[PDB]
Amino acid sequence: NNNSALSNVNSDIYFKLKKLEKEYELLTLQEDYIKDEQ
Amino acid sequence: TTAAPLLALLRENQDSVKTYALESINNVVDQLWSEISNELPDIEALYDDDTFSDREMAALIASKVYYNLGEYESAVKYALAAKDRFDIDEKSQFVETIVSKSIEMYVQEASKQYTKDEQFYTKDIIDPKLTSIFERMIEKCLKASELKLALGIALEGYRLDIIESALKSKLDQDSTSENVKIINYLLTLAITTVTNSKFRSSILRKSFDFLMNMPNCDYLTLNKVVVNLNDAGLALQLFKKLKEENDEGLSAQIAFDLVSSASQQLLEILVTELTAQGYDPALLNILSGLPTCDYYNTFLLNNKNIDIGLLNKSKSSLDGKFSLFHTAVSVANGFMHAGTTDNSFIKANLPWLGKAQNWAKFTATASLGVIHKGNLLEGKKVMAPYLPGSRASSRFIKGGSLYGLGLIYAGFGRDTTDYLKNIIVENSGTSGDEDVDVLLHGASLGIGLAAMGSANIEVYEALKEVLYNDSATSGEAAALGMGLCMLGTGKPEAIHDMFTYSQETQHGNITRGLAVGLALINYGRQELADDLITKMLASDESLLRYGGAFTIALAYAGTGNNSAVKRLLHVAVSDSNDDVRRAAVIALGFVLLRDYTTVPRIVQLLSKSHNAHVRCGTAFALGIACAGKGLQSAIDVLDPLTKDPVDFVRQAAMIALSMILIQQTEKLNPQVADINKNFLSVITNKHQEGLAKFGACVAQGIMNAGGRNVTIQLENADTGTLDTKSVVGLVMFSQFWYWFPLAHFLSLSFTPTTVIGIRGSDQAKNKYSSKPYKVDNMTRILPQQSRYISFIKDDRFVPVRKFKGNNGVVVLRDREPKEPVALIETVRQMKD
Amino acid sequence: ELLNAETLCFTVNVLYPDSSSFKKNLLKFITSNHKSSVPGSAELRNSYPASFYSVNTEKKTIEVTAEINCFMHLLVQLFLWDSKELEQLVEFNRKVVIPNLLCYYNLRSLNLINAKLWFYIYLSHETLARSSEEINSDNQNIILRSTMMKFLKIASLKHDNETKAMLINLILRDFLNNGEVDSASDFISKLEYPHT
Amino acid sequence: QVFDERIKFANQLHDEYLVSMRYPEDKKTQQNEK
Amino acid sequence: DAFRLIDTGALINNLEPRQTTSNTGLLNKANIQALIHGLNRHYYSLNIDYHKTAKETKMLMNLHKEQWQSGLKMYDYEEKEESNLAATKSMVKIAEQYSKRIEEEKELTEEELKTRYVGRQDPKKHLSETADETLENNIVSVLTAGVNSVAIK
Amino acid sequence: MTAAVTSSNIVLETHESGIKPYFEQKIQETELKIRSKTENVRRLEAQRNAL
Secondary structure, X not given: XXXXXXXXXXXXXXXXXXXXXXXXXXXXXXXHHHHHHO | OOOHHHHHHHHOOOHHHHHHHHHHHHHOOOOOHHHHHOOOHHHHHHHHOOOOOOHXXXXXXXXXXXXXXXXXXXXXXXXXXXXXXXXXXXXXXXXXXXXXXXXXXXXXXXXXXXXXXXXOOOOOOOOHHHHHHHHHHHHHHHHHXXXXXXXXXXXXXXXXXXXXXXXXHHOOOOOHHHHHHHHHHHHHHHHHHOOOHHHHHHHHHHHHHHHHHOOOOOHHHHHHHHHHHOXXXXXXXXXXHHHHHOOXXXXXXXXXXXXXXXOHHHHHXXXXXXXXXOOOHHHHHHOOOHHHHHHHHHHHXXXXXXXXXXXXXXXXHOOOOOHHHHHHHHHHHHHHOOOOOOOHHHHHOOOHHHHOOHHHHHHHHHHHHHHOOOOOOOHHHHOHHHOEOOEOOOHHHHHHHHHHHHHHXXXXXXXXXXXXXXXHHHOOOOXXXXXXXXXXXXXXXXXXXXXXXXXXXXXXXXXXXXXXXXXXXXXXXXXXXXXXXOOOOOOHHHHHHHXXXXXXXXXXXXXXXXXXXXXXXXXXXXXXXXXXXXXXXXXXXXXXXXHHHHHHHHHOOOOOOHHHHHHHHHHHHHOOOHHXXXXXXXXXXXXXXXXXXXXXXXXXXXXXXXXHHHHHHHHHHHHHHOOOOOOHHHHHHHHHHOOOOOHHHHHXXXXXXXXXXXXXXXXXXXXXXXXXXXXXXXXXXXXXXXXXXHHHHHHHXXXXXXXXXXXXXXXXXXXXXEOHHHHHHHHHHOOOOXXXXXXXXXXXXXXXXXXXXXXXXXXXXXXXXXXXXXXXXXXXXXXXXXXXXXXXOOOOEEEOOOOOOOOEEEEEEEOXXXXXXXXXXXXXXXXX | OXXXXXXXXXXXXXXXXXXXXXXXXXXXXXXXXXXXXXXXXXXXXXXXXXXXXXXXXXXXXXXXXXXXXHHHHHHHHHHHHHHOOOOHHHHHHHHHHHHHHHOOOOOHHHHOOHHHHHHHHHHHHHHHHHHOOOHHHHHHHHHHHHHHHHHHHHHHHOOOHHHXXXXXXXXXXXXXXXXXXXXXXXXXXXXXXXXX | OHHHXXXXXXXXXXXXXXXXXXXXXXXXXXXXXX | OEEEEOOHHHHHOOOOXXXXXXXXXXXXXXXXXXXXXXHHHOEEEEOOOOOOOHHHXXXXXXXXXXXXXXXXXXXXXXXXXXXXXHHHHHHHHHHHHHXXXXXXXXXXXXXXXXXXXXXXXXXXXXXXXXXXXXXXXHHHHHHHHHHHHHHHO | OOOOOOOOOOOOOHHHHHOOHHHHHHHHHHHXXXXXXXXXXXXXXXXXXXX
């Protein structure tokens, strides 16, 4: 349904965002560079 | 109400009403939090006193007030002072607030202390009350019976104990395959997220044992582990499992997989062990890779689709007595026909070749080894009339055959090493002539490939004496060759000797060759190689800095490390020596091979700058990153670089575009047609500049490269592992703007896109349609296409294991494994 | 400007958790309307593509009642303030909607809606006390006071900026009216007001 | 002292110009209108 | 620019392409007209790079003894008042010109506004260059005064 | 089945909600930092592009 097995919804979202946030460490690197570039 | 009554009770000195007061305060501590915060040192005085039982209660009040204050660290200190009354907030719809921050606080402590020691469970840095909360929260994930949550958060906390227990308990075999799947998620999550090498090493190695307790399992999963750690003992142990089965199909299949995936240096120690474990010589033939190369030869022999008329139109436009023009074509056609021995180039252009001399004639000879790349059986034979001592007309042909012979045995030249070395040691006593230099130059490039990653100190010594001759072209060629042979070793003698020699030499060519040869040596050595990088950039010499960029590229290849990437970005913008800047951007693509998705966002910044060399380095980096898989955004950043008037920028961009779109069609990317015609237009003009015509024609051959049988595979998806071979092809390719022969190295990066089914008992937009079409065995099958392939349920050839779903060798079980059914002949069988 | 059972039609038509029952009580008292609770007005859940479509929802492959429930609360609360009636009508609105939202942890998106609900409940209650002194109005203000600060603590957890800011206003207003500026001095010292 | 205060107020107005101005610019590159 | 003679016969045989083999170089032609006649009929021109050492750099970059005598040394403060007067007046004229412009700047087509209401040189831009030079000039000057007055006595 | 407003049937799927703010605040903290930093990196880009 939409609330039948809510713990399967919780697990997929938590797992995938862990991978994406390493790549979001690369976006804080990009922000640090352009402050020097200008 | 007011917190005013609550104060009164604290100021009153009767014991009964102070004990009462804490209970009143915690009841409405979600209404009066700001108010009671002002007179809270009173409550610390009660907490200290042991005239109370409500020391727990006194402490628990502080926790709630500090969270609402905004200070989370202290809220948790008082959480742990309070003792209990915290397991009731794990099921409330109001306050879970204080609990969650504790979990976050664990992760802080763990990171500091895992690096010091794995054991931090005996450490007192970690509070036991802090542990209990983190540990039971992960346990509650398993009570709801989703295990990903428990493995996901345990990796972060550096928890080895809980990850060990979790998988061990998941072995419950109600499907062997279901247990293996849970192992796959964790193997992925460690590698891509955690750069901490020490934790990663433990987590991969532990996975092996859980697979192998189960009898039916995936050996693709077992093999993955072996290549990440590069431990030859797991490998021999994997074979020990398979020798107990006496299973012909699995051992042969994972062996083909293994040679591609695992390091060349790794294979050499592995075979010596298998001989003494006791194995059949069939297997040890595979592990050499000589059979496996022939299987690739066949695939290319059959399917290569090449435009011979395009070769003529380019031939007409690009003159042969015009030397630069002649080179572009030789190289280009060499890539297009690359893979199988095709004598079409020779016959098409039969008078045209002889028109050229100097390095244009050097390239044409060595371009034969790009076309005839692989073809090991016939390796000496086809290059035979161009060999020193059967050719003497030109010094160029004599040298350029040795180099072309080296491509032929590139990664395969265990025999070839001695044969090339004889010529070098004969020529290393000379002071050398310019006649000799051209012969000696191709020997040194060739032996480099032949001895690539075989750790020949014989070759290191031999080429050191050539560098010490101080010869014009050969000193640079020798320098490259040592780096190739001694790839990855990180030998400190070699590192220092070459670093010093740059000042010693007075030739610029020779200086450039050393700087980048140190790059090759510090491959995969990341921050063990930090020290040399720092020094190379410290050099006031542009050539040493130019190689420094690539030394980062290779030390930190295929791991997205912010430090590696930061040094490159900063040098690139901040420096005034144009070579160095250009190199640095190209290095970015190499570091970030793995996260190839982030690359266009990062390097859009650099292409924006209108400095020529910056733009030129941008183009190759996108080329490198998206070579195996194309991205729309990647392509766009290149499109206004074919419309920049500077021709160096045009050369790079055209090659990059064909690098991204190698065998991609126009019903697969509607931009394929537009870009392809742009190259043809430059070739037609003879009123465009020669720099441009040179870039355009090289790219043209790259677009049809291999006969459109190959595409570049930076990283295999065989077991999900980086492909070393391709890195070396790409980085040597990038040296071509400064030395035209070195272009030819792109051939190492071409990887066949095919499924080769083998019968095991002799070893002979948004695409998906619900309408199949039939594909024949050993035809070009793209990586994208491999997942839309599914064996027919009941077929005569059925894959032995559950199909990996990507290009490579899949050994088949033939249902009736004895019939005389039609076979595809093999290049090995064609001989004998 | 336009009818009063116009709210009733939408609320009945969607699948409600109890909200329809809560709306209907109010209207029966002022002369009941039961018209347009007949099929085609109590059978359909309002055309949608798949988002909460009539067929999909009745079959219970979906029950995306979530946002729709928040919007139902906003309609009834508004309709009271528009009518300009106080006493009991207010008390009914307060009792139903406050625990409905707190028996689930609101998602980020739903949470910004419920700050506007907290406003109207509080405003009717305050003016009800300022209508007239009553021994029943007085005891109910302690009830109200408790909920305000509890709402704010939830708003802190999700760091949703507009929820918190709106809730901060209501606490300050109530302090100003009760003459507990002493209690308010502390509160303003622990602000960090979002401007986002 | 008086001049010192005015300048800082001016500088903070620049900062508020910076956060606001470039934030919607980014969005137009993101959305499709080509 | 540099030249080097090549054999007349070699040019007949198409051996000017020979001279650029084994690199892309920094190839560019800085001058034609008589140059490209003489190249064609005699020579192969060379590009020019510069060598210098790290010692020689330091010698070249150093060109003042007043390196340390330029932030303690100052200019007369009458000259500074003249400069502030000049600067403020100039930007006052540019502001009136800007004000005439920005009575509209609201109709369709930027280019039409630039002609009609002069945005010829853009008085916004023009005022920015002038503002920024004198603003930076004053911060150094005050800083020089305040260093000397407090430190020396 | 169970509704997506409040959780139907207490401490079966409300026990799941009971352990939900532990997963969810971790990535909300991550979320809040990177939305404003996503905005900020594109902001200072636009600026160095104009320069």
